[PDB]
Structures are given as C-alpha cells and as structure tokens.
Amino acid sequence: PTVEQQGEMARSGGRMLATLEPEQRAEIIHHLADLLTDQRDEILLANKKDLEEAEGRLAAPLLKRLSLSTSKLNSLAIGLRQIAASSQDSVGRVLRRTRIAKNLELEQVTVPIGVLLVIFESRPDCLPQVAALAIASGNGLLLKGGKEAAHSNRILHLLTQEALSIHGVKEAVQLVNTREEVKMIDLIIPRGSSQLVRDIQKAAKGIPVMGHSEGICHMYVDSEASVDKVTRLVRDSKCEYPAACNALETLLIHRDLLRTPLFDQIIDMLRVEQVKIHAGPKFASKSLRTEYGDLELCIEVVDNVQDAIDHIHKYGSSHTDVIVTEDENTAEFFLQHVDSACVFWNASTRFSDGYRFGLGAEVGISTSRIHARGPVGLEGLLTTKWLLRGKDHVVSDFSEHGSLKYLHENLPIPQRN
Amino acid sequence: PTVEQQGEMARSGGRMLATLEPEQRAEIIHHLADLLTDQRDEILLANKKDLEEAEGRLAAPLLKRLSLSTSKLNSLAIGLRQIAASSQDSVGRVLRRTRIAKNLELEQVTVPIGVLLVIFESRPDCLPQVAALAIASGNGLLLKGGKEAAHSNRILHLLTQEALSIHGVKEAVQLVNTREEVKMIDLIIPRGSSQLVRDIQKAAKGIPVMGHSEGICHMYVDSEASVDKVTRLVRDSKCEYPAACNALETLLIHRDLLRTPLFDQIIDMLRVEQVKIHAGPKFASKSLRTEYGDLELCIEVVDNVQDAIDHIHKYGSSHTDVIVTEDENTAEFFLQHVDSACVFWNASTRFSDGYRFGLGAEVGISTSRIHARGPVGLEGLLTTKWLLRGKDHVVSDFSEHGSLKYLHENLPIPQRN
After folding, report:
1. Which residues from B are below 8 Å from A241, CB to CB?
2. Which is deepest, A96, A201, B155, B301, by most CB within 10 Å?
C-alpha cells in the first residue's frame, strides 16, 4: 500500500481501537507480551541477522542500540503487562463534570490524539513499547524504522499485528517501508540522534514533534554527601551507558570537598573507568554545554547548592539532574528549585526511563514544558474533548437582562486507582 | 525597568508565588475580585477614556472588544472568586506515586510552567482573567497590551499589583511598555487577529505559542431537529456576536428538511437578522473554509450525520461544532466522532468560553491537540516534574545478574474534589 493508504488505515484502525472495550485493548497487549516470550527464539534469530549485517559497518551509536537480548525481551513483556493491567480507565476518562445551568451539562473527557508517527533509528526494542502504548491509548500508529533494524522490526511488527488480529484491528499499526523519506498524522515522535531529531523538528511544519534533542545531565555532589554513596552513583551515571541521553555529562562538586578522601575516591574510580575529566574554570583555580556521549566528563567546582542550581539552569538541557547529599533540607531545596523534567536525590541519572519509572514503557523522553514532560507513557498520547449537552440553550438568555442564570455546579467524578 | 529586568522580576515573583500557601494565592485573587467591584467607577472612567480616544479611529473588530461594562466587571469578579475557591490543590498536586524498589520512591507532581507572556490587542477584560489564572497556577506573567487599551490596562494592572502586595509579590505581574516590539519566557499566549496570532507563531522560534488562528465553526441541523429549537440556536450562534472565534460560519442542513416549514423559519430568521447566506454546491443543486466574522453564513446540504461529520473534519478548524437533533443516538454518534476541541448538542456555538464552562476564566481557546485543548484554565498553565528519592541506587544493580529487583508498586494518592 501507499503511505497515504497506510495513513488512512492507521486512522480507521485507531478509531476502531478506541471503540473497543478497555479490557479488549488490554487483551491485545497481554497477547503481544506473551508473543514476545513465546517467540523469543525467532525474535533473536531475526535480530542476529540485523547484527551480522551491521557488524563492521553500522555506526557505533546505532549499533549499540541494535541488539535485543533475552533479558530486554523479558522486561518488555513485563512492561507490556503493566500497561495492560493499568490502562483500563485511560480513554474516555471524565476529567471535569459541571452543571453549567439547569439542563445544561458539561463534561471534559480524554480522547486519543489520533494517529502517531514514530520515526526511530536502530532501537528495535522501542517498537513493542510504542505499539502497546498506542494500543492502550486508542491511537493509530505508523512506524518508520531504519534499514539496520529491518529484520527485528519486521518480526516485532508481525507479532503486533497477530495480537491486534484477535479484535480485528491489525490496520491500527502500520509499518512504513524504508523506501519513504522524511492532515494524516497528529504527532511525530523521533527516536534517534540530535541531528535526526532536529532535522525532523525542521521538516515538520504543522505537526507537533515530541522528544528531546539533548541530554546535558548534571550530578551535584553536596558537602554533606555520603562517602559510602558518591563513587558508585557517579560511576553508574557516567559509565553504565555513556551514550545514553541521561548519562552524566557534568559533575558538580561542592567546594568543601576538594581536599577530602571522598574526592580522591571519585578521581580514583574515574581513572579506573578510563574516563577523560575536563576541568571547569573554578575547578582549575571548551564548553559547559557539551554532551560527550562517551567516557568523558566535565568536573566543575561550585560554592553551594544555589550555585549548583544556577549552573544546572544555565548550562543544562532540563532533562535529568541529580543531588548527592545526606542533608534532607538541602536535597529538598534542590528538588524544589531545579526545573528539570526529572530531578533525583541519591539515585543515578540513568533511572529516567518509562519502564524504570513504573510506566511499563515510554514513547520517548520529553524536555518540553508543554504537553508531556519526562518519560512519556500512555497518558501523553491522550488529549481532551469538551462535551456540552443542552436543551435549546443560547448565550443571549444568560446576558444581563436575560431570563437565565448559570449554576456552575461541579458534579462528583469517579476516583481512579 | 528594561524588558529583560521585567522578565527577571516576573520570574522571581512567580517563584515566590509558587512558594506561598495555596490559601494565600486564593487570598490575592479574592482581593483582586473585590477591587474590580469596589473600583468599578474608576475602571469605567479609564475605559471611557480609551473608548473616546478610539472613537472614529480604531478598527471595528478591535473597537468592539474594547469596552468594559458594569456587567462584564461583575462576571469577572464572579469568575475570579470561582478560581480562588477551586484552585487550592492545583500547584504541587501529586499525579503519580510509585515505589520503584525498596527505598526507591517516585512521585510526579504539578509545577508552574514558569513565566508567561500574554500579548493581547484591545480586550482589557482579559487582563484580570490571565492575571488571576497565572496567580492561581504559581506563574510569573508579562502583559503586553495595545495602545488602544492603555488606560484600562493601566488601572487593571494597578489593581492586580495592589492585590499581589498583600503577600509581597507585586513583581509577579509585569506590564510591558507598549514601546516594545514583538530564555526568559516559557510560553506565549496571543490574543488577537489571525494575522497577529500567525505573526507571533512565526517570530517565536523556541518558545511555544498557545491559542487558535481560526474559528470555522459548524452547526449541523439533523433530520430529527426540533422545529421549536433550531431558529434560536442558529440565530444565537451567528448573530449574538458575529466577530467571535466561536461564531457560526457554516450551517449544515440534513436533506430531509429542504421542503419543510422548519427550513423556512430558518431563512425567515436569517433575513430578519439581515444575514448574507452563500449556497454550498449540493445546496445549489467561494470557499467552504471561510471565517466571515460578520453577518454572512454558508449553508450547505448534507445527506446524513456521517456527511456532516466528514464536512466538519474536512473544512473546519476543530474549534467548536454543534449538532441540533432530538435523536439521542444520532447526537451521541456526532459527539463521539467529531474531533473538535468542543462538541455541543442543542446548545449554541457561543458557549465555548472559560467563564461559561465553569473555569472562572480562560487565558484563551486552544485548537492544538497537544498540551491543552479548548478554553484553557489554570490547569493548562501547569506542567510536571518527576522526583526520585533513593538510598544509593544504581541501574547496574537491577540488571540481569544484579542484586536488586523492581517492585513498581503504585501507592495511594489523595482524591480531588
């Protein structure tokens, strides 16, 4: 089919998904989760083909994101079941209910955004995440993956369509031919390099784009930091996965620690991990807005929490920023005043992830201050609609000399759990 | 002060507002509401000056929006008290609470967007609305009004600052000198013409812009429409305020009504109201995407509800669209399938307004499908932050061969009312 026909099928499949009972959407997602487990061997075989075709040729950033492990598949399956189990009140949820006037009733409800386009390079593991999240939110979906992940994406899409078939909604998730280049789509979600993400931002006039182009993440080691905690926190944030959007890029160190064994153990762990430190200005006594995405790290000296906060605001990407301290007051101050999507106390920067956060999965991480901030789960794939049911109501009747009065009585709404 | 200094004061005043107790923000808003009433005579005197300076000179669209009536001031005061009374759990509200793992706790909370810039032409009545909504959501605010409303805006700003002074947060609401032309601002909210709204959309690289550039609104008269209801609904939607963004632009008529007294009474009321009808194609047997903003109206014939829905989707601005019918099934079908921000049954198009909807006020009406849809109240002025409090937690510990397991236990959260 043509990409325009895929758009139309995703839209009609999306609309059918939204009219299913919540339990039926959950059923599709449970089935997909089972298929990830049951079909692991074939999944891994197709991923092996991708890896072998990529070996020696695909750029290291893309290559690292290409592999699918038995472990990863196991967490996907766990995450998809969490979505299935938690998503039942999601679509058509009543947000507001107001009696505007006698016989004039308003409600505000959640509805799907419509049709999503996810454009991802490498990352076959995001296919099941975004498909399950779209399914759970009643959305249609077009998937545009790269050549490098063709075998993996192909099988993962097949399985998704097998899961959808149980309620006759295969059309809801379309795989776009790698042939195609970058009114139909309501939202674009790019998953890849800053260049791809900014290229997409540029070519998308009209359509909103959801994500982040950068991950300049900080960790502030406070004067009251536990010597028993700092090293492993810095090591994990920087070294567990240097290429990650939430990898540590700038280590901010309280001044009271420069002549301390705590500071020594840090430099010791950084040299054991073969990490290139670049000294910030104060510290010495290139750029503080750099994402290394490798075994490199900025270390700068600060005077106090306020200084750390100021630095994070000035140089950071508002993605993930962390304080290490034993002082609760100081920690809570930092958590309150750092304006990042994700602010942590005594936990690694690497925790910002939909699955880790108990969302089951993410479509991506957003650093926007509009719509959806941080890892975006199913709720960031919904918008709203205002419904007004009247008798014969006109605004003139409510004017100064009119016959009618407003009541504006908010009515009770079902609690969530 | 310079506009950069105003930015900094709004930001610091915003941050102080957010750290106040909810009851103190409510107190500021209650005081402002009282001042609108107590100072009505001076407000009206300043507005009279604006009107007299505008008389014969200001463009009719801007002029119509320039007047402040004793009535309008009364509804502002009522709307501001509704905000004060309903806004107490708004800022810092817990959205999600999850025990990620033993001693690793996550919460997602609401926080202010930061600093808002509202750019409005004419409309002095929006000043108190946007100021009260910003105050209630913990935001800083810069107001950029036009020369035509200088006296009104001046007094309304003065009073706002008097209200803020009770908790020492005058700086939170800045009035930008009409001198200035179109890192500091987190959101722009334009209130004016499609040209201004699109000029702003264009000049704002970086900053999100919230609103609508168009109001092509439809009303579908179903075959099962009550003859006793249609005429007054069409008359109000079109004639009560033709220049309104939510004024009726296209009347869609079910075919089963062409040879009916119901149809006759419509044309009769349209001629009494001296309204220029332009026949759609089918009907006859210029453009269907036109906003007249005057006593002009498109009438097109349709075959059924599906046809009406298709037409609304094709030609409409997804703002406000209405069905007139006595058949509940048909009405609910329309309400479900029309993708507009606001869909009504047997109520005038003119009801889409923050005050009318029980929001107390609006910052504007949004036709976006991201962030905030329809009239935007205080809740569209909030974003979120993820807080993670750990012990010494690292992601490696949770890996396949690690020591730690996730719990992902959602914890109970306080209900709202």
Report:
1. 395
2. B155
